[PDB]
Amino acid sequence: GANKTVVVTTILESPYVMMKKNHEMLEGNERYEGYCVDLAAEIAKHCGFKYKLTIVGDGKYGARDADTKIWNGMVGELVYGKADIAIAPLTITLVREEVIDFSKPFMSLGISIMIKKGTPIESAEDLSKQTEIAYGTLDSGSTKEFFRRSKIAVFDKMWTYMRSAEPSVFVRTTAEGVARVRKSKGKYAYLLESTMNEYIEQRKPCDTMKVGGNLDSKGYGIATPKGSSLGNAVNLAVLKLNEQGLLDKLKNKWWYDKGECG
Amino acid sequence: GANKTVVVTTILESPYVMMKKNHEMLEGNERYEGYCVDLAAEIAKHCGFKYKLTIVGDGKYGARDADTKIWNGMVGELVYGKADIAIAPLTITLVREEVIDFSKPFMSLGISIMIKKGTPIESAEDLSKQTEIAYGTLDSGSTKEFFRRSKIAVFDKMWTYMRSAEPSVFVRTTAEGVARVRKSKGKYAYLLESTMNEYIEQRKPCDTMKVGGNLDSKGYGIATPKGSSLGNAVNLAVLKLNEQGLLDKLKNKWWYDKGECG
């Protein structure tokens, strides 16, 4: 069985995957840039395969519909054989681990609070005790699911708040959440994964801040279909890249080396 | 094939596994206490197996002799079938991943610097540039191997320093390293995993401090023999315990709830 080009599924999400400014002049994988573009190339180099970057059709990370039992997002593309590997800020979770294979984490993170500078909030407990400062999450993904499924008193109270708050505290994209923080004069706080919070804190106009400790401790993993032979090699590649210091260099490149906030 | 009692290998290392003060009055698993004792019980409860805690014979975590190609430590006990699972502060590394299976991490950590309070050191770079303040690691394990194998200029210089420094800067146990920091009047700094550094910082006589950022970003994993059926279940149990908040509660219990330094 001859080797085939590996189909990678990913998602447009700065700074992980972005279309280059001059992408119309380019073709194939060269149209894209970012942390996960660089990571894909490093993994392919170490493992010795050719690959094609593709963008997940439905714009989702991965969840199972309770009624149809169908998996959507990048997880679904792996489950149904439409892609060979997912390389994205994809959180390792129990229900996802049951249906796909994950590498050991290439990045550690946790849920965190983004505020407009000057907002009198220091913690999740602070948020949970009040309603003047509205707060919410993406309307899809592991951050929302954290609150929806939590049995911890503070986070379950926060979820009950989010479901019943008006106007809706949910956002469709990271950009919408960040924009809402920036335009709401301190009256909206955004719950999001800490590494995204850190990235935005170093972007103009430098008006946001990460506050408080993380609410949990999770990781992003490279995902493959359950039992795929590619899985073992890619996991070893992640560990090698981490042990060589290259993952730390990649985060510095896309987060801090060109930070815009001094 | 009837079920059998699961043989767990672990290692005496505070606060992960300790013999209880009254252990002579007790028997079996009840002789022991600590973070990994509690974790083993939680994993066994979720997975529905009985188990026996045993202490690794050679007191090592796991490495392969370059000449004989024999694996020692807890990794060796798994490789050669002497134990079914290792539950310990065992770092997930590439060479270990090649021969045993690892769960996703139950704890995140990195190499860090422990100083006696008042030592004029803030970073690994600070240490690397001088010799008046001696510095070293355990004489076995992943922290030592980090320096021995590093191709990063600062850490390779530190390793060349450690090999050639007199008297020997290596220690046999965590307790020896901590004691050496405490007795050396600021002239010894100890390189060790960050969660151990954090634990000791909250122990009397409250004379040590963790300084600087971590040098790397790694995780501890539950280990099983390659291909063991127990591996999948235990990995799902780790993810469940993390998602329920129980791993965070376990760290707080053994690190901070009874911290001795205010």
Ligand SMILES: N[C@@H](Cn1c2c(c(=O)[nH]c1=O)CSC2)C(=O)O
């Ligand atoms: N990592 C999440 C998706 N996701 C992401 C971000 C966030 O803040 N929350 C969230 O749930 C910033 S990049 C992706 C998942 O795998 O579902």
Ligand SMILES: N[C@@H](Cn1c2c(c(=O)[nH]c1=O)CSC2)C(=O)O
């Ligand atoms: N986790 C290491 C062993 N190990 C440990 C500690 C440390 O500081 N360095 C180190 O290498 C404090 S508990 C165990 C390993 O798996 O080899």
Ligand SMILES: [Cl-]
């Ligand atoms: Cl092809």
Ligand SMILES: [Cl-]
């Ligand atoms: Cl038995």
